From a paper:
Purple acid phosphatases belong to the family of binuclear metallohydrolases and are involved in a multitude of biological functions, ranging from bacterial killing and bone metabolism in animals to phosphate uptake in plants. Plant PAPs are 110 kDa homodimers, containing Fe(III)-Zn(II) or Fe(III)-Mn(II) centers, and a recombinant isoform from sweet potato has been shown to contain a di-iron center.
rkbPAP incubated with fluoride crystallized in a different space group and with different unit cell parameters compared to the sulfate complex. Two dimers in the asymmetric unit are observed yielding four copies of the active site. In these structures the metal ions are on average 3.5 Å apart, a distance significantly larger than that observed in any of the other rkbPAP structures. A small sphere of electron density is observed between the two metal ions, in a position similar, but not identical, to that of the μ-hydroxo in the rkbPAP-sulfate complex. Thus, the bridging ligand is shifted 0.2 Å closer to the Zn(II) and 0.4 Å further away from the Fe(III); its distance to the carbonyl oxygen of His323 is 3.6 Å, compared to 3.1 Å observed in the rkbPAP-SO4 structure. The sodium ion may offset the charge of the metal bridging fluoride group, and possibly prevents cations (i.e. sulfate, acetate) from binding to the second coordination sphere. However, for the M1 site in the fluoride bound structure the metal ion is shifted by up to 0.4 Å when compared to rkbPAP-SO4 and rkbPAP-PO4 which then results in compensatory rotations of the side chains of Tyr167 and His325.
Numbering used by the authors:
A (entry chain A), B (entry chain B): 9 to 432
The structure:
């Protein structure tokens, strides 16, 4: 089901050393920066990025860094990463890449300054891959009636690791394919199990190697010491990104960072507290059932204590929306091991149904558990539309439907500013 | 309670560039190799080690590597690691270090070839530290009527991380302190939370940095890609070392390694399957209560399926021995969350009461849970004395009793060669 190499979506842009696989993401904590990334295949080229606003058309230049890597018998092209800083809020900018030779121009609109009642619409995509279904999902995100301004990617990008020797060529195709979206609006990356790429058989033992080279994140901005876990603030949301396949035992770097980070969250500045992770803590599907238990025992109580609004995960190739529940009262022998309704707990949503390599997870645990509000084995994507400090409307759009149809939609009542029961 | 710097046990060996902090560990998979480690403070010196059999007085030389590191404003002396290989079984060997200038001689006895009924006695020490209690525990072990032939260290070594800026000098003192034992018999290293040393405040973001530089392990011998988890075979035991503070999520390096390692175990060759980890999966004490839950969800079922004989851990500053139980039938809503008797399960023992910095954990969950067979808050060490392929004798010696007293002692009946109920 994977799209052939000659497909139009994997078309290489014309012109000598023409920049390709162009993508961007927030480059600082508050939204005044952006990391611009792209690859050149003919030669190193320049890492300089020329930019300017639509209004204050003063053209400026930012220098970046170039790098390369090798996997098996695969050798990458020239990967460029450049950060544009001190940008003005809510203003459109134009940026050009490939100044040395063939130049290409794109644009993006910085988010508005963070604040209590700042509206913003987040796209939710997980386990995209590069199958025909992946193309449909992405198209639906773009043609969505509601204008998505940033994508929160829950993990599992290209699925190159399914090819022989993980044929990283499939990483480059994925970059050209998603360019039509990521180059114009930021995607906040989460690391999934397909990015680990631990392959001892072929002497490739550095976890997340290809992914980490191709996709950078502003982790130092939140005092994290690893790109696999970090935080950013955008508009009225505080987004926390975690790594399911990194150490999370007590005292470990990720564990320690998260504990301190939850303490720095200010619901007065960013009322919507969102958490991303690849593997779902709540999942009633057969596939990967209970794989989220470990991390759950570790962080669930914290999510409840700090009343996180939502937790988005992927991994399971389907869709699921839980009720607000918790299972934090277990003590080995007290028998309290059943999830109970907890209005202080976040809703857990799994949206790893963007397409992957074309397979869907339909085998579900039966009967549907009480903690599971809604579930369905269809390809699709989601949208978290923040209206204000009290309301956020989440909707799920299926690939079999019209780009404007919402097979499932719910209103989120902020755990901090609107303590009302938003159950369905 | 930590012993003062001028303590006799921290004395520095005389002579220019005299080798100090000498220690050894198995250097291969089966026991025909040994890693010799030591530090020189006055100058780099030579990494060559001269060794010879007590029988075959032929003196040979093994070349090694030297390294150094810095923590904060601390600069280490010169660290040497040299592996002596192709040794003969069950034979006494003499080795000398510091050949360049001041030389020091020591010895060790290679274990006998691996076999079904090969007897061997392993000492168990966890969370030693360097307080006076630490000195007492080490004394008892050296004076044990039953001589220990190899120590299985279950994590938390020097506790230097408790000093300002983790004053790494406390790593050097611990090195001299433990020498009187580790330089003659190998100690099998397990990494605990005090080795993590994650200190972002002073730009020390590399987990296990000091520990990984000072203590090496033959991790590649078992095809592991990290020194924090590995396996070795000694006599009639197959030992698996795990990292409580490394990633263990499905698909991670450690997770994958263990899954395959277990498949390579051969009970027809090494009948005793022993697992070491720092954080206990079963712990009825208040301190660190339920910290091992995450790893348990991940590996408990594997331990039961492969019928591990024993699992040793530390972390809790006390002693505990559990019944053979398993808590692997939980499915979120089926209500099966109570540990039950399971003869396929290993016994879980907490033995992190070697002394640490002089504090003991006496507060425990009341009443004592069914899964807990024996628990007591006293400083001490354990002894796992393997007799045959079918019998092994474990004993716990407290620091307040005579060196040959056994406050707790039980016979272990091999899960593969003598599966009889050994409850207490
Ligand atoms: C890597 O090896 C495969 C076959 O093992 C081969 O088809 C492929 O072309 C090699 N990669 C390159 C581009 O050298
Ligand atoms: C492409 O750009 C590089 C930038 O240094 C330059 O050296 C090279 O001459 C250019 N190629 C041509 C001749 O078009
Ligand atoms: C992918 O979808 C886009 C937009 O709908 C379309 O233009 C393109 O032809 C599709 N490519 C493939 C290979 O289906
Ligand atoms: C937030 O927006 C919703 C519209 O979706 C509206 O009904 C609600 O009254 C607003 N709440 C506040 C705090 O103004
Ligand atoms: C290291 O720095 C500390 C202050 O943080 C100071 O008290 C100590 O004397 C210094 N020691 C060394 C090794 O210079
Ligand atoms: C000490 O040994 C080193 C290592 O070979 C040598 O370079 C140096 O000259 C020696 N000095 C003394 C005091 O023996
Ligand atoms: C502890 O170690 C041995 C115990 O036999 C003894 O020789 C030594 O003096 C003691 N050291 C300290 C400082 O307690
Ligand atoms: C080993 O010794 C124990 C106790 O002496 C005995 O009960 C057991 O049967 C023996 N096992 C073998 C295989 O010799
Ligand atoms: F997946
Ligand atoms: F500890
Ligand atoms: Fe996936
Ligand atoms: Fe300890
Ligand atoms: Na799978
Ligand atoms: Na699977
Ligand atoms: Na998968
Ligand atoms: Na504590
Ligand atoms: Na503590
Ligand atoms: Na501790
Ligand atoms: Zn996944
Ligand atoms: Zn510990």
């Amino acid at each position: 089901r994977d799209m052939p190499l000659d497909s139009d979506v994997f078309r290489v842009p014309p012109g000598y050393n023409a920049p390709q696989q162009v993508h961007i993401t927030q480059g600082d904590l508050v939204g005044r920066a952006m990391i611009i990334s792209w690859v050149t295949m003919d030669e190193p080229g320049s890492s300089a990025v020329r930019y300017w606003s639509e209004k204050n058309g003063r053209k400026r230049i930012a220098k970046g860094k170039m790098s390369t890597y090798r996997f098996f018998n695969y050798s990458s092209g020239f990967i460029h990463h450049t950060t544009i800083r001190k940008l003005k809020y809510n203003t459109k900018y134009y940026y050009e890449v490939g100044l040395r030779n063939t130049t290409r121009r794109f644009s993006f609109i910085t988010p508005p300054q963070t604040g209590l009642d700042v509206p913003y619409t987040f796209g939710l995509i997980g386990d995209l891959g590069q199958s025909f279904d992946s193309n449909t999902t992405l198209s639906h995100y773009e043609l969505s009636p509601k204008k998505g301004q940033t994508v929160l990617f829950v993990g599992d990008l290209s699925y190159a690791d399914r090819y022989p020797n993980h044929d990283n060529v499939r990483w480059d195709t994925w970059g050209r394919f998603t360019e039509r979206s990521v180059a114009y609006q930021p995607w906040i990356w989460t690391a999934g199990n397909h990015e680990i790429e631990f392959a001892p058989e072929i002497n490739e033992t550095e976890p997340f190697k290809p992914f980490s080279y191709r996709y950078h994140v502003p982790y130092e901005a939140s005092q994290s010491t690893s790109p696999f876990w970090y935080s950013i603030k955008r508009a009225s949301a505080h987004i926390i990104v975690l790594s399911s396949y990194s150490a999370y035992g007590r005292g470990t770097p990720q564990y320690t960072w998260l504990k301190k980070e939850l303490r720095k969250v200010k619901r007065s500045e960013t009322p919507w507290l969102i958490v991303l992770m690849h593997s779902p803590l709540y999942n009633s599907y057969n596939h990967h059932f209970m794989e989220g238990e470990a991390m759950r025992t570790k962080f669930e109580a914290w999510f409840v204590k700090y009343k996180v609004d939502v937790v988005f995960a992927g991994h399971v190739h389907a869709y699921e929306r839980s009720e607000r529940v918790s299972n934090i009262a277990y003590k080995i022998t007290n028998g309290l091991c059943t999830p109970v309704k907890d209005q202080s707990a976040p809703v857990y949503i799994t949206i790893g149904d963007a397409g992957n390599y074309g397979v869907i997870d339909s085998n579900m645990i039966q009967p549907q558990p009480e903690y599971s509000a809604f579930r369905e084995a269809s390809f699709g994507h989601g949208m978290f539309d923040i209206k204000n400090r009290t309301h956020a409307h989440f909707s799920w759009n299926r690939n079999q439907d019209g780009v404007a149809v919402e097979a499932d939609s719910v209103w989120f009542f902020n755990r901090h500013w609107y303590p009302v029961d938003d159950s369905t």
